[PDB]
Amino acid sequence: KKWLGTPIEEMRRMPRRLPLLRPSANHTVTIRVDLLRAGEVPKPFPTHYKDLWDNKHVKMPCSEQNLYGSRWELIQTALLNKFTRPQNLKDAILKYNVAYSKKWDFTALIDFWDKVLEEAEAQHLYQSILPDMVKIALCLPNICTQPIPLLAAAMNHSITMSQEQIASLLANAFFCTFPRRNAKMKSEYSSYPDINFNRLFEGRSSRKPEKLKTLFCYFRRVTAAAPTGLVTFTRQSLEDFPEWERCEKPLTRLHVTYEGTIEENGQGMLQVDFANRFVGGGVTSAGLVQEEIRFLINPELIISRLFTEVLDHNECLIITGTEQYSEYTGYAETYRWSRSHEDGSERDDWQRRCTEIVAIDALHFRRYLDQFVPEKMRRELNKAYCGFLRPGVSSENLSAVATGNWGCGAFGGDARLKALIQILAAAAAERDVVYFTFGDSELMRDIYSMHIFLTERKLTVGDVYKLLLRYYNEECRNCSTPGPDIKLYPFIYHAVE
Numbered sequence: 137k138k139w140l141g142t143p144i145e146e147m148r149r150m151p152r153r154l155p156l157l158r159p160s161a162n163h164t165v166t167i168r169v170d171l172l173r174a175g176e177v178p179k180p181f182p183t184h185y186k187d188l189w190d191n192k193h194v195k196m197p198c199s200e201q202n203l204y205g206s207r208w209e210l211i212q213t214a215l216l217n218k219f220t221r222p223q224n225l226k227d228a229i230l231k232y233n234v235a236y237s238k239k240w241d242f243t244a245l246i247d248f249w250d251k252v253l254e255e256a257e258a259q260h261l262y263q264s265i266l267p268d269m270v271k272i273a274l275c276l277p278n279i280c281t282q283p284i285p286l287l288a289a290a291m292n293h294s295i296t297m298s299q300e301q302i303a304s305l306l307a308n309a310f311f312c313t314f315p316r317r318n319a320k321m322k323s324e325y326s327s328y329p330d331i332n333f334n335r336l337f338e339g340r341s342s343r344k345p346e347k348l349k350t351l352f353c354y355f356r357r358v359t360a361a362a363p364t365g366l367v368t369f370t371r372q373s374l375e376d377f378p379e380w381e382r383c384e385k386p387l388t389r390l391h392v393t394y395e396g397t398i399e400e401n402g403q404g405m406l407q408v409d410f411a412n413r414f415v416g417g418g419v420t421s422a423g424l425v426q427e428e429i430r431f432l433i434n435p436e437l438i439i440s441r442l443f444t445e446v447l448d449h450n451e452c453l454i455i456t457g458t459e460q461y462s463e464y465t466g467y468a469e470t471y472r473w474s475r476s477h478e479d480g481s482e483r484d485d486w487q488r489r490c491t492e493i494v495a496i497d498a499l500h501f502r503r504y505l506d507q508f509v510p511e512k513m514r515r516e517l518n519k520a521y522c523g524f525l526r527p528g529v530s531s532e533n534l535s536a537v538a539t540g541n542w543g544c545g546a547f548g549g550d551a552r553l554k555a556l557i558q559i560l561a562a563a564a565a566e567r568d569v570v571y572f573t574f575g576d577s578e579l580m581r582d583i584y585s586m587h588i589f590l591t592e593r594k595l596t597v598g599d600v601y602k603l604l605l606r607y608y609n610e611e612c613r614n615c616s617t618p619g620p621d622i623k624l625y626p627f628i629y630h631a632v633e
């Protein structure tokens with residue numbers, strides 16, 4: 137069978153009652169809520185640009201305090217020039233980035249324009265797409281009129297902004313205009329991800345043309361017709377975590393399948409981003425696995441890098457309303473942009489697409505057995521729990537979690553352990569689980585078998601967590617070999633039976 141467990145049709149999904157959208161101490165809203173109307177471009181609030189240049193807000197490229205002379209005036213002069221050759225664009229970007237003229241490589245940008253694109257596609261790029269991108273970038277002070285707070289470590293805070301505002305900001309990131317975000321050995325913003333796109337232009341990987349095609353598809357779409365909706369970014373930091381060994385909650389339902397993807401088959405569900413602690417990972421440099429792919433096909437995710445500080449162990453980032461602009465095939469070395477995608481998601485009463493994504497970063501384990509250490513299992517349980525918990529929401533109102541082999545592959549996670557950890561965390565948060573094994577049918581069967589075994593025997597979250605502690609002590613703590621003598625799921629079956 138291609139899937140096992142509860143039919144996916146029985147899982148809860150959004151949208152199938154939001155309070156009034158309003159700014160407050162914990163919610164920054166950058167549009168006029170009284171004028172928010174379906175199918176209409178939102179109006180920025182306030183009407184006139186207001187600047188904050190300090191350690192708690194984004195340092196805007198258009199700030200009168202962005203100096204070198206006015207850097208914004210220099211950016212305008214540099215970018216309001218005809219581009220007919222890729223060198224023209226490199227020279228323009230470097231005019232206001234002189235210190236990086238010998239450090240930043242533009243080989244991928246030159247190769248994309250001169251060596252990947254046919255003549256007609258290159259002419260379209262420099263006659264239409266790039267000039268339109270410049271104009272929306274330079275419109276920033278009329279679009280993004282309200283200071284954007286940094287979502288700093290330990291802040292529980294939300295930002296709601298328009299897709300149009302995000303497009304203006306991302307066009308600035310493409311042209312590398314955000315100040316104080318470039319130095320390798322920086323103090324300010326050292327705990328924040330890269331935002332400027334300069335590393336997208338470097339090197340000769342065959343992945344870069346696919347990344348550029350995916351992003352130019354977005355830029356062509358949102359400069360041609362302004363998107364009309366909103367996106368919310370919420371940093372969530374929890375302090376009260378379950379006492380996992382004493383948790384009496386039962387397991388929830390499971391649908392597990394080796395076909396499908398989180399973003400296509402988990403529509404309306406809480407979609408997990410297998411995130412780097414610097415959210416978005418290598419999206420605008422070299423990475424191209426699950427997180428980077430999602431950030432490329434839903435580029436509004438990328439702007440989280442402008443204002444989201446690196447995630448601590450008890451935090452996540454929740455993004456609601458991003459739109460899918462591209463379809464793709466493959467991943468990593470086989471990733472290819474396929475075509476433009478028309479997103480058919482409904483919008484909620486805040487005009488946000490009904491798409492909710494949570495970024496939770498797994499640990500990277502240099503040694504396979506490290507992840508069975510109780511502190512490390514508890515860390516991952518609490519990270520998933522923070523990503524799944526919605527304080528103040530009834531369980532009947534929570535969609536299923538759509539996830540998969542979180543932290544596996546490069547970070548060395550054990551898929552069978554990580555699956556059970558997510559099942560326990562979802563159970564504690566009172567959510568069902570939809571698990572995509574991405575081609576691995578044996579893993580599907582194994583996860584299903586363990587899940588049904590535990591539920592039919594009515595084991596609680598705590599019952600299972602104590603079995604994980606026993607596995608560590610019996611098979612991992614005093615193991616001198618890189619691998620344990622008995623695997624986790626066999627151990628659990630034997631211990632219970």
Ligand SMILES: Cn1c(=S)c2c(ncn2CCNC(=O)NS(C)(=O)=O)n(C)c1=O
Pocket residue numbers: 396397398399410425426427429466467539540541542543544545546547572573574
């Ligand atoms: C879209 N999509 C992808 S592409 C994927 C996936 N499961 C594996 N992949 C391939 C990328 N491989 C990694 O991402 N390994 S990892 C944990 O990120 O470090 N699912 C569930 C998915 O929906």
